[PDB]
Symmetry: C5
Subunit: 314 residues, 5 copies
């Protein structure tokens, strides 16, 4: 009669998603529990309510007790898995427990970013038992604590839904072993994005918009050129926040459109300066009044069009 083991898991943050690296990490907890009568012992010999061991994997205590124990290993791990606060509890009846904080580097496919704020992604963590079916079997999942695992603020990713389930996969020379896979769906956590990149662009565009109120023109033109230089420098300072890809991300569409518009502003300023100096100073005011109300309209139209094209059907 194979013994039955209950298992739970929880994730506190997921860090380091790189297109080139094709791998990531995860930090969380893990809990194992089962009952085997062979572990039982008389309290008279020990003289203690319970017995415990610290700072050792299941493999080591299994080797030292000379009894089989439910070892495991993550399916796709790379290098080594760090473990702190490892402990294992033994009760006189014969129950057991095991708690471990962990951090694993896992292997991942190549993602398809395209839409940058959207970035709906799937993450999966697989846990496998290193003993055949007859020795031990996963029975039921303990949905303890919060798989969301909110601690403070936010991290590089946020959770939106998840689901754990268990299966059986083939083992060596016949037989099988239990598997326990958790699947996650995540979102880019756009708070940092809106608060760091979009607001400075809004201000830098708005200043170039407002310089049109002037009645002189030379100062207007000088300010326009200076602001275009500042816009180029700002576009640079983002730098490594737009990973080197082949195709276009919506951020890139916005950057290109804003840059073209600012260059148009400087061209219009030169033309207005000449028109004013020639003598037809009346029509310059008309052109100013046209542009003042043309710009916000076109920006709204472009935002709406991009929304329709990239966030719904058709």
């Amino acid at each position: 009669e194979s013994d039955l083991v209950t298992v739970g898991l929880a994730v506190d943050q997921i860090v380091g998603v790189d297109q080139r690296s094709e791998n990531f990490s995860v930090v969380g907890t893990l809990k194992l529990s089962w009952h085997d009568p062979k572990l039982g012992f008389s309290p008279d010999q020990c003289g203690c309510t319970v017995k415990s061991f610290e700072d050792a994997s299941i493999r080591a205590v299994a080797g030292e007790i000379n009894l089989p124990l439910p070892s495991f290993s993550f399916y796709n791990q790379q290098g080594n898995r760090w473990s702190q606060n490892q402990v294992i509890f033994v009760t006189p009846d014969g129950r057991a427990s095991y708690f471990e904080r962990f951090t694993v580097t896992l292997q991942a496919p190549d993602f398809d970013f395209l839409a940058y704020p959207f970035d709906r992604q799937k993450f999966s963590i697989k846990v496998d038992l290193a003993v055949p079916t007859n020795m031990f079997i996963f029975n039921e999942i303990e949905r303890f604590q919060q798989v969301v695992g909110d601690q403070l603020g936010e991290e590089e990713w946020v959770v939106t839904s998840y689901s754990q389930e268990i299966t059986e996969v083939p083992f060596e020379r016949g037989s099988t072993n239990s598997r326990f896979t958790t699947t996650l769906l995540v979102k880019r956590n756009l708070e940092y994005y809106i608060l760091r990149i979009f607001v400075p662009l809004f201000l830098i565009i708005s200043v170039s918009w407002v310089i049109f109120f002037l009645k002189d023109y030379g100062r207007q033109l000088e300010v326009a050129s200076g602001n275009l230089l500042v816009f180029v420098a700002f576009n640079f300072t983002i730098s490594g926040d737009l990973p080197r890809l082949g195709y276009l991300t919506v951020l890139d569409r916005f950057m290109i459109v804003s840059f073209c518009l600012t260059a148009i502003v400087v061209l219009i300023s030169v033309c207005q300066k000449r028109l004013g100096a020639v003598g037809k100073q009346a029509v310059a005011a008309q052109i100013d009044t046209w542009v003042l109300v043309i710009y916000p309209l076109v920006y709204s139209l472009y935002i709406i069009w991009v929304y329709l094209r990239f966030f719904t059907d058709h």
Copy 2:
């Protein structure tokens, strides 16, 4: 009598072509199908129409069934190949199937970029069977779905033609095994290139062109110097989109020519300012009228010359 197996393949995107790294990746699908009577089974014992297994390579189920199965492995893969949605179907008659999504890191030569938009390149993926000829042989290729594999928008590369075929290569200690090689021809997907690099250069050149309309000269000169600074900064912001090579790419020819022309503009502006302040203000207008129509002509001539030299014979 060696059993016969039909195989198909399809590619959805090819990412990460680096001159230094000398390797790339590919993500796609794979399908295998064959028929062996030994797999047959009476429905009375199973009580099911079909039998299936999930999330295991061919090697594992082959080891657990204790029957030979058509395993495989990519010819030049590096590290590990990621697999999702693996499944294998067994029918009571004795047929079989196998579907697997995959992503492989392959080894590649050193390319010769030279012409940057042109970049005609050849990519090849090789699939080999890990069993001798007597056990299994590739028979015919299933041209299923679309080897083009268009999903949405575009990716770092596009497909223009392809061709699959099968051969035989030597195996260990005599005998041979089947091989199935797909060859691709690709193009740089210039849409991102024209929409991100060429249009901003066109605007930045055009503004410096238009400042000549002015009749004052000090403001013209100041604007010219500012625009040359902006052009240098923009040339920088492209940055890592022009990989560090030894030789010249057509983009570099264009950048150098545009920079030289803008420096010429600032020199001409200084000379015109002096000529105007000296007293001969009439000839300055003549020089302006000459330059206004000289520039577009020379740009057209240079574009045509480069086309003739680098895109056809002689």
Copy 3:
């Protein structure tokens, strides 16, 4: 009767804490001492007060003496551990000693930076004996020299508290071995931070503050735009001192707020220039007097609010 060994340790600096690398290093000393009668020898044969060996680990001299010796190895080391000034002293009575300077690359979890100046962190170094319990056992810890290990100035980290203790962990095929773990708590050593990043920002903000005293407006506006460009460039020059993360660090909050304020300054300057040129030159002075005393107030309020939110309860 297992022989008893006393052990001490000290750390001189800890370098290279990288979020991506997930590892660090440490340089310090180490001392081992114990007594076994078998090592004793008659001074008549040697003719020397003491006997010594140089530049060899414990393993080598243990192999060459053909007597067991207390070897060790760090628990999580990577690659190789560099050793200089290795020496081992043998006294005629039978005592021993061993001194070694060292530098180890250790494995570390993924940290959670969030608050950048705060960065309370935990570092741990584990030393294990490579012989079973019966051969040798750690007895007591020699708290020699200074675990703080102050040498000159400061380094990338500073020490605030520590504690060493010994335990027992399972070994191969039964039995156990001694362990000796030192734990550290560290602080970011904010001196470099305040002296390099904060003072230049204070000056760059202050200059933009002071330009308001002017009575002309065109020069004020030009200076404001120039200063905003300088602020962007300075924000860049810090560059790699703000590691590429997902979330917000308090430095980023400060940068964003300062940038928004400077853009507001340039907008206000344009509006003031128009108001002055229109004819209502009196109210411009009122606006200047308002802003002059509004800015420092808002900066103080923001500093206080951030302190309350991120450095105490609630």
Copy 4:
């Protein structure tokens, strides 16, 4: 009687010479030819004029024929060598052939750059046979095609002379094996250098030279400061084309001298502005006339001096 084999080689381009990496690559061809009567076969059985095999190294066909064959391997290769268009021809008489395109990553010393355009360097490729002397021996070198291997334009390096020769080196447990080493001498291919870095510096220096013609001084001074900023930015944009070294490269001497001269220009402009505003406007013209003819003289003298010091004796 050891069979005799003739061998040829050719190189089409050499890429990736990095001081830090201490290694490079090479892409070219290779040809092997020899005659052994054991390979002979009667055309009646085959019914074909010749027999061929494709896409396999010599080792594989040697293992499958069960006859010894002249295998080889590059002496210092790293990782794996890529091979395309591999083929081997067998004639009824008993002759043989083998053609292979290849690309190898080789190990290299640390070079001493110093003079950057000069960079005389030595490259060597070694080919070794993996069978003892008795089995096979290199006899004569086939100087086929062009070891220069010019295809189109140029690449990161150019060839100036070469020489191939064969020797014998010790093998395992007595005996020796043939070796075939090709040596190359290369040049930096300065065309890209002169056309991308030197011409923009010439224009940027020339504009600052020409601004002196002016008679006003404020505009002259503003232009001078702007041009010095542009020169700094340009010096940056080269960036990774000047590898991080300790010592000085001739490019660095030129950059430093040009920068110092431009700073001198701005100082002279300030002094001239003050001298003009004081009242002694006559001597300012004399200073202008002095500088106008001083600068080109000093540049010519410096170019000549550097030539004499770093390109000939003494």
Copy 5:
């Protein structure tokens, strides 16, 4: 009777000292000489004055002669050691020789930079014999050629003193083997530093100093702001020449102080402009005369103070 061998070494340049990499390289020569009668041979059989072999390590010729030979290997080498011009000479009497140019990648601790021009450092290269004491022993050191090894100009490091000596270290299963360690002391070779970083800063500070001579103020203020921008950009262009560390290097102290002073200059310029426009134009000249002589004094005082604090006692 163990044979005696004389050994010499020389170093031509040491390259690649990186704080993060914790390793470096070295390129130099090596010479070995000894005499064993077994190598003797009658000239009648050979018919040659001497016998030689080329391009093979000691191990290979030792394996092929079937006689013991003094092999060696560097103590801390990583990867592979490149060898060119290897040769070994055998004389009829029985003498021997061996010359080899080499380049080795060695392992190194983590250095403590602090003072950047000072950087007194210790480098050590260890050579070990791979045969026990009875076979061969290092006897005396040949101080041939120049351990300084000056060739042309300078390299990333310079030599100031050195000392070689030999010892004995334990070997496998008893016995020992000879060791030969060379120790070096090096200096940063400040010539490049003073000629590339310090002179441009001196000029950039001096121009901002000299602009005070002016009598107008608007132009002075504009120039001051422009020069501060140029100073920021220049501080950037050094970039990777100041490695990312935690603590302060003397270069950083100088940069921060200069930046603060230039910001003070721009503040003073604004205040002077207002004071002049208000009407009290006399005191502005007094302030100019004060600053003109205040600045050089404070710079001299700061240089002296830093010298006293960081280059001597107390």
